[PDB]
Design a protein around this nucleic acid. Structure first.
Lengths: 56, 151, 117, 55
RNA sequence: AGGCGGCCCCCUGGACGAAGACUGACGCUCAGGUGCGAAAGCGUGGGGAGCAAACAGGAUUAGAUACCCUGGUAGUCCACGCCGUAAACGAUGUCGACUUGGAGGUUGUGCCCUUGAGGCGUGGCUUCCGGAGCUAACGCGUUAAGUCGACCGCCUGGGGA
């Protein structure tokens, strides 16, 4: 994805935008779901465990 | 201090100089409550110190101190298991005592005849910050900056 | 060399390290540096200022081409991807916008099992 | 949503990188969001909503 | 029911919202009996990204046949069977009748100028609070763990098992 350079704009102002851009999903965080091997029973209860955590 | 806030004792002003800030130095130099001999140790040095100052005697004392003043120091966090050091700007009220306290502790580690030669030289050195104390702050100057992002 | 004035700093900010690569538009990488290839070992490799220093070491040896602009590549969570970009700020660079570069698998490989530590 | 041919409004359901935004943030009926995917993944081969900006 | 989620066609199948005809007990239960049947594995023909048993290498440890790290066989994906077992749980047999309540959701559907996303009924399912009641209590509590009708199923100290 193109992250383009404009005129007169310091690299610091986008610094906030840089992490905000991919934090929406998280490249390595979703990488966290291909690093090892997981049983689907994990996610389903992961959904189950996460589902319970999601009930304020 | 966890529940009760605390203050600092209002040490008496100098009998000869009449300075409270200079009072902590003698108390810092004061040992085993020897105010009888403590201020004489302070009184003698600047009189010799003034001779090798040219600029003045009482102000010469401050010029060397600014060289060793602790601007920043590290307060540990010790929460999770790694020895965290979160830096903080120290109030100069305690800073000067640290500045004065450190200068005193370095004179004892010298080979001259006496602290009159040792103390007179160190502050004269501290005037251009070339004594034991001034390098001590520089050492403190890197612990708060090498761990800067780790505040 | 060769004057380009428009480069590309691909920031790979790993959980242990933050590696950023300089490249041109076609993608032909011109330069590349790592936070962990910049001092820090083990724990210290994955620290922001470690990613910040990586940018210092990555930000140099890529303007020797006379690069004047360079589009950036965000990558994953971790210590870098924020300090590296900040150090890149130190040189007085320009950047229009920053766009997410995340490959979002739509239910691909079987997930990882948590480290039973 | 209803059809794959109107990618103009389909674009509000996609982030700038081509990954379909959660309808939860967009809202939309629970059934309606499904029609979005029907117009997106398969209709990909009709070039409706971009992958991302890589090439 | 397990179990079912990227998109399209065939077919299915089940399920509920409004009236109108149809026949009239043609109903519920079921030993035996009959089908299906989460996951893994295996047999057999393929496939083959991730990987990950077993199994190889590097670390801790006094020791670590493990946890920490690099590999890794099987297998996981398309075709025929077997195996038919699991926390297959709401720990809640099946069908029909009665019963304060409270508060939402969703799903039909009439009504109401929608006079506006609303107001007023008529069904289904379901979410949370709870009268009574009852329970060893725990709590359940109009989807009853409160009040009745039929069939089926089942238990008689602990271990051995």
């Amino acid at each position: 994805p193109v992250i383009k350079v404009r005129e007169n704009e310091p690299f610091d102002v986008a610094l906030r935008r840089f992490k905000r851009s991919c934090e929406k999903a998280g490249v390595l965080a979703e990488v966290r779901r291909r690093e090892f091997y997981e049983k689907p029973t994990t996610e389903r209860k992961r959904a189950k465990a996460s589902a319970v955590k999601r009930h304020a | 201090p966890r529940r009760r806030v605390i203050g600092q004792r209002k040490i008496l002003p100098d009998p000869k100089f009449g300075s409270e800030l200079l009072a902590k130095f003698v108390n810092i130099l004061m040992v085993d409550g020897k105010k009888s001999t403590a201020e004489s140790i302070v009184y003698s040095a600047l009189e010799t110190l003034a001779q090798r100052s040219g600029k003045s005697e009482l102000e010469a004392f401050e010029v060397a101190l600014e060289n060793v003043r602790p601007t920043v120091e590290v307060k540990s966090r010790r929460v999770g298991g790694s020895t965290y050091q979160v830096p903080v700007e120290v109030r100069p009220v305690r800073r000067n005592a640290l500045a004065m306290r450190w200068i005193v502790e370095a004179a004892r580690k010298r080979g001259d005849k006496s602290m009159a030669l040792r103390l007179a030289n160190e502050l004269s050195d501290a005037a251009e910050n070339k004594g034991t104390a001034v390098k001590k702050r520089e050492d403190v100057h890197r612990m708060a900056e090498a761990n800067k992002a780790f505040a | 060399r060769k004057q380009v004035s428009d480069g590309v700093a691909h920031i790979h900010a790993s959980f242990n390290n933050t590696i950023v690569t300089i490249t041109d538009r076609q993608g032909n990488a011109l330069g590349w540096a790592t936070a962990g290839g910049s001092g820090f070992r083990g724990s210290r490799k994955s620290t922001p200022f470690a990613a910040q220093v990586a940018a210092e070491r990555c930000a140099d040896a890529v303007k020797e081409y006379g690069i004047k602009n360079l589009e950036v590549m965000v990558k994953g969570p971790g210590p870098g991807r924020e300090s590296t970009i900040r150090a890149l700020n130190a040189a007085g660079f320009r950047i229009t916008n920053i766009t997410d570069v995340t490959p979002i698998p739509h239910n691909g490989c079987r997930p990882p099992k948590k480290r039973r530590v | 949503e209803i059809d794959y041919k109107d990618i103009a409004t389909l674009k509000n359901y996609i982030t700038e990188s081509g990954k379909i935004v959660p309808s939860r943030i967009t809202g939309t009926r629970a059934k309606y969001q499904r029609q979005l995917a029907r117009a997106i993944k398969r209709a990909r081969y009709l070039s409706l909503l971009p992958y991302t900006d890589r090439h």
